[PDB]
Ligand binder design. Structure first.
Ligand SMILES: *[C@@H]1O[C@H](CO)[C@@H](O[C@@H]2O[C@H](CO)[C@@H](O[C@@H]3O[C@H](CO)[C@@H](O)[C@H](O[C@H]4O[C@H](CO)[C@@H](O)[C@H](O)[C@@H]4O)[C@@H]3O)[C@H](O)[C@H]2NC(C)=O)[C@H](O)[C@H]1NC(C)=O
Lengths: 91, 48
């Protein structure tokens, strides 16, 4: 089903435009009973980045969600060029 | 005596050879001069 989704979003069907930033898949592992092979093949594989996670006892995964709202991300509007179909210069 | 000073040993070599492939997006451009002549510039492509 995952390969049918990437075909519908035009991902990988071109050599000049991969469009990998238009689908991200994150898989979280809840228990000790975890097949790490199956959770890795479903998640995306983008460069210098992690998408597979394995934790135990559930409550620590609730501990990562209150911790992420204390974490502030420095948002950077610099160097952003998104492909808008009005490709005159200075865009 | 003016002939032996103005005599060239070779004609110009300066070849702006650019290669466009439909598998890529950038043109692969080499400039071959006299000193850098007789030097193969291999570009391998696994797609036919
Ligand atoms: C979303 O999807 C649609 C559908 O695929 C896509 O439409 C495409 O738009 C581009 C322009 O943004 C089209 O590209 C050009 O189309 C004209 C005819 O309309 C051609 O004549 C052009 O060929 C010349 O121009 C190029 C430079 O502009 C030269 O490099 C080239 O050698 C020629 O001289 C050019 O192909 C494209 O045809 C359509 N495709 C379809 C199937 O309609 C749209 O752009 C997508 N949106 C985004 C943001 O990508």
């Amino acid at each position: 089903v995952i390969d049918e989704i990437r075909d519908l979003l035009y991902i990988g069907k071109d050599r000049k435009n991969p469009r990998e930033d238009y689908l991200d898949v994150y898989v979280f592992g809840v228990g000790p009973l975890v097949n790490q092979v199956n959770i890795n093949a479903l998640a995306s594989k983008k460069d210098n980045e992690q998408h597979v996670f394995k934790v135990k006892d559930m409550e620590n995964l609730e501990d990562v969600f209150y911790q992420m709202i204390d974490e502030s991300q420095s948002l950077s509007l610099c160097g952003m060029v998104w492909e808008h179909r009005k490709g005159t210069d200075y865009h | 005596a003016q002939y032996q000073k103005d005599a060239p040993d070779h004609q110009e070599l300066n070849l702006d050879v650019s290669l466009q492939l439909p598998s890529r997006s950038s043109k692969i451009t080499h400039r071959i001069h006299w000193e850098s002549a007789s030097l193969l510039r291999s570009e391998e492509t696994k797609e036919n």
